Design an enzyme around this catalytic site. Structure first.
Site, mmCIF file in Angstrom:
data_model
loop_
_atom_site.group_PDB
_atom_site.id
_atom_site.type_symbol
_atom_site.label_atom_id
_atom_site.label_comp_id
_atom_site.label_asym_id
_atom_site.label_seq_id
_atom_site.Cartn_x
_atom_site.Cartn_y
_atom_site.Cartn_z
ATOM 1 N N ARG A 1 -25.050 120.159 97.770
ATOM 2 C CA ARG A 1 -23.643 120.514 97.930
ATOM 3 C C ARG A 1 -23.348 120.934 99.366
ATOM 4 N NH1 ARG A 1 -25.731 121.555 93.659
ATOM 5 N NH2 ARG A 1 -24.931 120.850 91.630
ATOM 6 N N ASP B 1 -7.631 119.494 85.983
ATOM 7 C CA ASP B 1 -8.237 120.428 85.027
ATOM 8 C C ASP B 1 -7.170 120.945 84.070
ATOM 9 O OD1 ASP B 1 -9.302 120.991 87.989
ATOM 10 O OD2 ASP B 1 -11.058 121.007 86.671
ATOM 11 N N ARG C 1 -6.116 118.225 81.643
ATOM 12 C CA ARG C 1 -7.106 118.099 80.586
ATOM 13 C C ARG C 1 -7.006 119.243 79.565
ATOM 14 N NH1 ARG C 1 -11.578 116.413 85.125
ATOM 15 N NH2 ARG C 1 -11.614 114.170 84.571
ATOM 16 N N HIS D 1 -11.522 124.211 92.103
ATOM 17 C CA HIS D 1 -11.721 122.981 91.332
ATOM 18 C C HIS D 1 -13.233 122.705 91.279
ATOM 19 C CE1 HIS D 1 -11.081 118.910 89.822
ATOM 20 N NE2 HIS D 1 -11.677 118.403 90.884
#
Lengths: 309, 312, 309, 312
Positions: free
Chosen positions: C84, C144, C147, C171
């Protein structure tokens, strides 16, 4: 980057045009102007319910000053005229007053004229406004042509988008169907009939045109007014302008040599865009069609010359 | 409940792009995805099924052949693409075999709708689907030249600076190397293109028109040469055809349908102007062709039959 | 009065965003920019077939100069990053180059950032561009939240438009559902459940949130990439801007005191219009929710402080 | 063929405006007009049937009760309006008699769809339609307070300068003098209006909110006082309700439906938030009310029952 359409006249035609537009979602702002200010406020109030139902057009009763930033001014107002002659005079007077007030606001957009006689009043608007011809447009035969295609679509059991025919001339008694240019898909109508409508006759086609020519009469004789049809026509024209379509519509525009006509507004296929009428299209006409078109021009000029210098 | 359902077989670039176009256009109520790799296809469906909270109400899921029972349309995009080591006939044989299995599985479910075939070679595989399904020709439709015709009208719309709805031209024949422009029937508004050009396109040349057709014919090649793949274009054509059927338009589209005497052709699927509606292809329209156009169309038909003959 | 959206990056995300937009008919002009010029020309060629199918958006491959008149620049480009940390560094480098070229064109519109990590890269864009916070917007938790509402809509067998819930925060892993503010129609979710979902449990709701949090993971594990979902989110945000909606969307925006947070981009309900983000809305949070939001902020800042002064 | 059909009974200003809204929104496939004056109604249909060549494909014609057989929805807008010389009860009796004949003619055709009632008094006439038709309560729906609620949200959207989709308020009760705003349930985004105002509307006053509700309650009166008639507003509400049914939304609309215990009310149609879908009204939603709101709702119900009691 918002668009604004001003509607002059909130009778049946203007109000139905407003309602079509709100439901189709064509312009951002719609301003209503008419003589009775209190009534017009009521008209706007009833029309202004689209937003909570997902139709975002803002609608309000305004004044001529609101034309300054307008993209389009649509004139539907008129007299309510026993004889045709008396009515044209009354409407010419009304239009001078309306157009002067619009120009006085600083308006520099496009006029759409709906009021009948639409060709004569489109010419009036052009004269009174001093604007270029491209930016003064009568609805003309837009509705006649729509009816012509719709009836042919039913006759041939095919989508109306595949019917290609025009009504030209005065929006009225001297209109003509241009059968020599009528195509079903890409094929001339006679060829298509030979193959797929063998029992069809010239009688059937003549009846179709008569049905177009007399449609308003037959609506009016039953319910005493017509407005929904011309509303849809006006919305179609408005979309061609606001969406810069460059599409062919049969509207009333000024002749300056096309078809060997001059100094008359008359219904012809024309390219319509954000520029207004970019071009009056000259299509080939047979002798009889050209003769009918010139007869229609002569007819219009006989109405015009008593009114305009 | 009066709901419509489209089943897409093959969820590669073409099938997935078709699904996405459909979701965004709001054309069908229900969309079922079927493909060989079950886990991948589940993932495809998951990614595609986000329209609802964004106001696109189409229901999208990964399914199986049983879900074809109630489908109005099955769109076949699955199949192999020709690879260096094999001929056109070798590809036809391979894809014909693939289609035999797919069509048997579809019919086995009780399906009684319309097939749209997208897989290349689309004319040959539409004919194969007709043969394999036992369905009436009306209900088996290849996308054919729908995209070629759209490109043709688009290019002409730009050339004449007029709305594409006022351009009237067709591409006919095989969807591929032997397709032909029907210039003798091409109209700008109501007028033949030659007349329109005489009046309004003074700097125009017949060479420009040839260039336009070459651009149409070679469009896929030029897209592939740049980005390695093509799929958005055909997806839009498939959505257009789907809309004509589901909305019962009875409009003219150049699609691949069976010749049974039209244009003096027989026993071949080929791209022609046709009336498309909820009934499928109602009619292959016969438009008058000049001698050179008719010759080209027959050459195209011959070319198709040469690669079909050792299999069908 | 035409609108223009520029898309930087024509990989799966940018191309799917382009395709959603063309099919939805949201902007007049779409310009595609990416590193491989020949490839991008191909991408534009494949995308530019809407017009003859009734989707009028003009689509072309351009260059940074085309950003001058753009209303929105959407950045989807990125590196393709084993850890990451390595990925964020690579993407920060990419963004500096992109943003400098955009600003160099004279661009004065709104940035939408889609590339992950979206909060960090939205902050980067704000820093690099020198633009006001209102005009630099990360997609944030828009997807998000979509959903979350969609899953609740299925759980309650009701239209998703009547589900009212937010995902806030990064996020990513430290996102939180704001259950204390979740309503079914106008009623708090617990009350609605008491009446219409009596066998429902906190277990079911926790599972719903886990499904949201891990959705991308579960898509990626099956088909190896995700793009359609974020495309729909980006189109939603784009419509709110171009249509001047003033609607509430959970996007990534800069904190300047809201929620007692400062100097961080993070996903919060915000009013979105032609002005960009007009307001980051402060909703009441319970103690646990506020704690989770500050944890998410702290998490983001730990990624940011190694990159930005 | 999976087509939808809506029949409109009454082609006065409300019915005609409803038809025109529907044509322009493209909500149904087929629209049949029925009214007493056959020749006028033929003319109404002729004027309305120009959508097709302008790209609005709805089929519109003047018909008769037999055309209800296949209809999904019958929308009743016909009836008398109260005139100076008569009471509210006198109007109820007169319109109830009118509805008995209309409903008998509809049911006589074999109709098995959903009724939408628009005629005032809409709650009373929806109850009458339920009684007369013998249909389940789910399938008999009064437009109720759908327009009042829309106006309420619109006014609040302007007051807060935010998208109307983010305003969450209901008007409940009789569609008329005794309707009530449910301020205890009104939310701006997710937050109670009081909290939102504390944060973002500092110059705001409870007096402004009262003014907003008065504006809703008296909207029809103020339109009529200016232009003599009202019809566009209710037409949009009817189109909205029609869309929820035909598109099977399962969304919350404040419509008039039968109370069978909800809110401790019985044997009355009244405006409440309700789930609306292809099934009709799936559920009357019970939202928590404060004591004053509950008192107002019961007062509203009592008011309705006072004018129903000497007839039903």
């Amino acid at each position: 980057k918002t668009s604004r359409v001003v509607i002059i006249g909130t009778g049946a035609v203007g109000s139905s045009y407003a309602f079509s537009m709100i439901n189709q979602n064509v312009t951002d702002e719609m301003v209503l102007i008419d003589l009775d200010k209190r009534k017009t406020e009521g008209d706007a109030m009833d029309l202004n319910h689209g937003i909570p139902f997902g139709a975002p057009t803002k609608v309000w009763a305004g004044d001529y000053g609101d034309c300054k930033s307008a993209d389009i001014v649509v004139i539907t107002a008129g007299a309510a005229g026993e004889t045709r002659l008396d009515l044209v005079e009354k409407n010419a007077n009304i239009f001078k007053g309306i157009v002067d007030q619009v120009m006085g606001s600083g308006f520099n957009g496009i006029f759409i004229i709906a009021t009948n006689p639409v060709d004569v009043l489109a010419y009036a608007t052009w004269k009174f406004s001093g604007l270029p011809k491209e930016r003064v447009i009568g609805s003309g035969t837009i509705l006649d042509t729509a009816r012509f295609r719709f009836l042919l679509s039913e006759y041939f059991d095919i989508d109306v988008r595949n019917i290609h025919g025009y009504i030209m001339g005065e929006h009225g008694d001297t209109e003509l169907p241009v059968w020599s240019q009528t195509r079903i898909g890409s094929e001339p109508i006679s060829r298509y009939m030979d193959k797929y409508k063998p029992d069809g006759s010239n009688k059937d086609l003549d009846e179709i045109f008569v049905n177009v020519r007399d449609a308003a009469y037959h609506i009016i004789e039953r319910k005493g007014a017509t407005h929904y049809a011309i509303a849809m026509g006006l919305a179609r024209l408005t979309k061609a302008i606001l969406r810069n379509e460059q599409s062919i519509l049969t509207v009333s525009t000024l002749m300056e040599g096309e078809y060997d006509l001059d100094d008359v507004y008359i219904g012809v296929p024309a390219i319509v865009s954000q520029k207004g009428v970019e071009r009056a299209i000259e299509i080939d006409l047979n002798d009889e069609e050209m003769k009918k078109l010139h007869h229609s021009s002569n007819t219009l000029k006989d109405v015009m010359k008593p009114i305009f210098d």
